[PDB]
Structure 1
Amino acid sequence: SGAIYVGNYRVVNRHLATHNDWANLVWEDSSRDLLVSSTTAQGCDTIARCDCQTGVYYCSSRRKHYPVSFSKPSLIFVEASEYYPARYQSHLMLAVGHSEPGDCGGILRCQHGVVGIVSTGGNGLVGFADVRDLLWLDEE
């Protein structure tokens, strides 16, 4: 589990969005496994605006923050999960590291702020759904 709270937006894995997230939908993209919903309260998080390829992610299945190198956001074939059939996932960054399904929502951070959230993995990889291209999360 996990979310990003920036301005009056909540950014979650689409596959973990709640009833309230759908009722209060701002934007979602199945191919990215992202959903953004509106919030009452102001969030404290900053979104990175950068092309960093190094950062730190939170892995709930290890209770550990791991420094990683990751690929630039790309279109990657992802095997079937509980939530999606086997398909190409877009805006996805890969790193060598530990990931289990319930690690989804773990934040990946760089010096500039939030880079993305855990969305995929296994096989000794972790995949993050990038948010840095979503410039509108910084306004309105």
Structure 2
Amino acid sequence: SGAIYVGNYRVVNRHLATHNDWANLVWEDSSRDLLVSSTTAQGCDTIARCDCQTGVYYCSSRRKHYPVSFSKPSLIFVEASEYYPARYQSHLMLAVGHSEPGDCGGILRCQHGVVGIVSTGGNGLVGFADVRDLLWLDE
């Protein structure tokens, strides 16, 4: 679990979105595993606007933050699950690191701010759904 609170928006994994998230939907994309919903309280997370390939992510399965080197956002094949069939997920970034299902929603950050959230993993790897291109989150 985990979310990004920026202004009047809440960013979550699309497969983990609530009834309230769908009732106040702003935008959603199955190919990215993202869903954005409106909120009444104001958020204060800063989103990075950069091309950093190093950062720190939070891993709830270990109660620890880990430094990681990660790839540039791209189309990567993801094994079928109870939420999605076998498909290519876009805007996905991989790193060598610990993750298990339940870690989805953990924030990845560089010095410039929030880069994205845990979305895939397995085999000693971790995938993060990028959010730096969503310029409308700030405006």
For the criterion TM > 0.5, the same-fold answer is yes
SS in 1 for 2:22: helix
Structure 1 segments, 4+ long, off by >4 Å, are none
Deviation at 1:82, TM superposition (A): 2.8
SS in 2 for 1:22: helix
For residues 28-87 of structure 1, the C-alpha deviation after alignment (integer angstroms, 9 at most, x for no partner) is: 000000000000000010100000000000000111100000000000001112321211
1:32-43 mapped onto 2 (5 Å cutoff)? 32-43=32-43
* Larger CA deviation: 123-132 vs 73-82: 73-82
Across the aligned residues of Structure 1 and Structure 2, the Cα RMSD in angstroms comes to 0.7
SS in 1 for 2:20: helix
Deviation at 1:99, TM superposition (A): 1.0
Query: Going by fraction, where is helix more abundant, 1 or 2?
Result: 1
Give the distance between the partners of 1:67 and 1:82, measured in 2 at CA: 30
For residues 100-131 of structure 1, the C-alpha deviation after alignment (integer angstroms, 9 at most, x for no partner) is: 11100000000010000000001111000000
Aligned to 2:99: 99
Give the distance between the partners of 2:77 and 2:53, measured in 1 at CA: 20
Give the distance between the partners of 2:23 and 2:89, measured in 1 at CA: 25
Aligned to 2:65: 65
Give the distance between the partners of 1:64 and 1:82, measured in 2 at CA: 28
Give the distance between the partners of 2:66 and 2:83, measured in 1 at CA: 26
Give the distance between the partners of 1:111 and 1:56, measured in 2 at CA: 9
How many residue pairs are counted as aligned between the two chains?
139
SS in 2 for 1:21: helix
SS in 1 for 2:45: coil
Give the unaligned 5+ runs of structure 1.
none
Give the unaligned 5+ runs of structure 2.
none
TM-score by length of 1: 0.97
